[PDB]
Design a protein around this motif. Structure first.
Motif, PDB file in Angstrom:
ATOM      1  N   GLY A  50       0.767  -1.243   0.000  1.00 48.74           N
ATOM      2  CA  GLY A  50       0.000   0.000   0.000  1.00 48.74           C
ATOM      3  C   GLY A  50       0.797   1.292   0.000  1.00 48.74           C
ATOM      4  N   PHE A  51       1.903   1.316  -0.740  1.00 46.76           N
ATOM      5  CA  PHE A  51       2.663   2.547  -0.952  1.00 46.76           C
ATOM      6  C   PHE A  51       3.240   2.568  -2.360  1.00 46.76           C
ATOM      7  CE2 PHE A  51       2.587   3.489   3.647  1.00 46.76           C
ATOM      8  CZ  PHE A  51       2.511   4.874   3.626  1.00 46.76           C
ATOM      9  N   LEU A  52       4.422   1.981  -2.523  1.00 46.30           N
ATOM     10  CA  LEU A  52       5.038   1.845  -3.836  1.00 46.30           C
ATOM     11  C   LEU A  52       5.083   0.373  -4.258  1.00 46.30           C
ATOM     12  CD1 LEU A  52       7.994   4.370  -3.353  1.00 46.30           C
ATOM     13  CD2 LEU A  52       5.963   4.797  -4.747  1.00 46.30           C
ATOM     14  N   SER A  53       4.287  -0.444  -3.572  1.00 45.80           N
ATOM     15  CA  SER A  53       4.206  -1.882  -3.822  1.00 45.80           C
ATOM     16  C   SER A  53       3.616  -2.207  -5.195  1.00 45.80           C
ATOM     17  CB  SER A  53       3.384  -2.560  -2.722  1.00 45.80           C
ATOM     18  OG  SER A  53       2.114  -1.945  -2.578  1.00 45.80           O
ATOM     19  N   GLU A  54       2.669  -1.382  -5.635  1.00 46.75           N
ATOM     20  CA  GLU A  54       2.022  -1.558  -6.933  1.00 46.75           C
ATOM     21  C   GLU A  54       2.547  -0.548  -7.959  1.00 46.75           C
ATOM     22  OE1 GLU A  54      -2.205  -3.211  -4.963  1.00 46.75           O
ATOM     23  OE2 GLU A  54      -2.228  -1.465  -6.287  1.00 46.75           O
ATOM     24  N   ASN A  55       3.576   0.200  -7.565  1.00 44.23           N
ATOM     25  CA  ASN A  55       4.199   1.207  -8.421  1.00 44.23           C
ATOM     26  C   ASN A  55       5.200   0.585  -9.395  1.00 44.23           C
ATOM     27  OD1 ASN A  55       6.347   3.314  -9.139  1.00 44.23           O
ATOM     28  ND2 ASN A  55       4.774   4.612  -8.201  1.00 44.23           N
ATOM     29  N   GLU A  56       4.972   0.807 -10.688  1.00 44.09           N
ATOM     30  CA  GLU A  56       5.786   0.209 -11.753  1.00 44.09           C
ATOM     31  C   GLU A  56       7.184   0.818 -11.861  1.00 44.09           C
ATOM     32  OE1 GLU A  56       2.555   0.994 -12.010  1.00 44.09           O
ATOM     33  OE2 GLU A  56       1.485  -0.326 -13.398  1.00 44.09           O
ATOM     34  N   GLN A  57       7.255   2.149 -11.875  1.00 43.85           N
ATOM     35  CA  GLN A  57       8.525   2.860 -12.072  1.00 43.85           C
ATOM     36  C   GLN A  57       9.481   2.772 -10.881  1.00 43.85           C
ATOM     37  OE1 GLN A  57       5.583   5.355 -13.438  1.00 43.85           O
ATOM     38  NE2 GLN A  57       4.963   4.302 -11.555  1.00 43.85           N
ATOM     39  N   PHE A  58       8.983   2.290  -9.744  1.00 44.58           N
ATOM     40  CA  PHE A  58       9.831   2.055  -8.580  1.00 44.58           C
ATOM     41  C   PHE A  58      10.697   0.818  -8.798  1.00 44.58           C
ATOM     42  CE2 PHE A  58      10.516   0.488  -4.133  1.00 44.58           C
ATOM     43  CZ  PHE A  58      11.296   1.549  -3.693  1.00 44.58           C
ATOM     44  N   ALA A  59      10.076  -0.248  -9.302  1.00 47.25           N
ATOM     45  CA  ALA A  59      10.764  -1.499  -9.619  1.00 47.25           C
ATOM     46  C   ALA A  59      11.771  -1.328 -10.756  1.00 47.25           C
ATOM     47  CB  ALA A  59       9.757  -2.587  -9.958  1.00 47.25           C
ATOM     48  N   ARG A  60      11.379  -0.583 -11.792  1.00 43.80           N
ATOM     49  CA  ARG A  60      12.266  -0.272 -12.913  1.00 43.80           C
ATOM     50  C   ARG A  60      13.507   0.459 -12.410  1.00 43.80           C
ATOM     51  NH1 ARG A  60      11.658   4.215 -14.676  1.00 43.80           N
ATOM     52  NH2 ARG A  60       9.800   4.377 -16.013  1.00 43.80           N
TER      53      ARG A  60
END
Lengths: 96, 94, 96
Positions: free
Chosen positions: B84-94
């Motif tokens: 519930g923060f950047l867990s579903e954020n795509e550009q964080f993983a990239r």
């Protein structure tokens, strides 16, 4: 309906009935380890079964007097439980 | 092959991750904001750093570039986003 | 060797792998209830298995560097640890 692509809050509830640690395994997959390997000790598909039942409750600062809305203030007294069956993954409420 | 781990989260989930990683004999790193100066998850890890000394306490956890700046300056080779923060954020993983 | 005609300290360890509360069962046996009944709800002989493995030890004041003699006094600081799979049972250890 949808897909949650991570660990959810209610993850603990499943770990207790299955026996397998979800969060631990997450880190182990990041290292490149095999599921049924010596490091995760994950049982086979027909070896994974549920033991008993499990129930989860989240302890927030919501109440039907303010209709489920949070409050500010120092936590003067914190009384926790523990024991058999009761699982506590705490984090926020303590001394004050 | 992981030496040390950072948790991009706070609260109960962070503490859960630190306990898991320390069980795998992996060093732990935690981040906090202006209002979480005394959140429990700050202390349960080996290393604790302040993120966004200028940015607000709500936005601080959702700052992709600054969380990487901490991980880099600490030899962190793995980050657990939690939920519930950047867990579903795509550009964080990239 | 011998028979222990009561519960033991280490009872906890067996509770975690079978999923049965011995202490609670123990009380219900004194009430005249059946384990294969409404009150206890214990699974039949061969339905019981062990979900994984469990370990127990006791934290005492017996100083290991000094012939295991219980050091007495006043505790100033105490910090426990929860986490999934970890069951705590506090005796005399508290922050004062």
């Amino acid at each position: 309906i949808e897909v949650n692509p991570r660990v959810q809050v209610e993850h603990t509830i499943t770990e207790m009935v299955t026996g397998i640690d979800i969060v631990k395994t997450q880190i182990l997959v990041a290292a490149g380890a095999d599921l049924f390997g010596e490091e995760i000790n994950m049982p086979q598909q027909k070896d994974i079964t549920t033991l008993g039942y499990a129930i989860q409750c989240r302890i927030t600062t919501e109440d039907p007097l303010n209709d489920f809305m949070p409050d500010t203030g120092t936590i003067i007294a914190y009384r926790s439980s523990g024991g058999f069956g009761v699982r506590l993954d705490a984090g926020d409420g303590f001394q004050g | 092959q992981i030496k040390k781990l950072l948790v991009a989260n706070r609260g109960e989930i962070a503490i859960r991750i630190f306990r898991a990683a320390a069980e795998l004999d992996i060093s732990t790193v935690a981040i906090y904001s202006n209002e979480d100066k005394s959140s429990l998850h700050r202390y349960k890890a080996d290393e604790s750093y302040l993120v966004g000394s200028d940015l607000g306490p709500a936005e601080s956890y959702l700052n992709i570039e600054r969380i990487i700046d901490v991980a880099k300056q600490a030899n962190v080779d793995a980050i657990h986003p939690g939920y519930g923060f950047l867990s579903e954020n795509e550009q964080f993983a990239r």
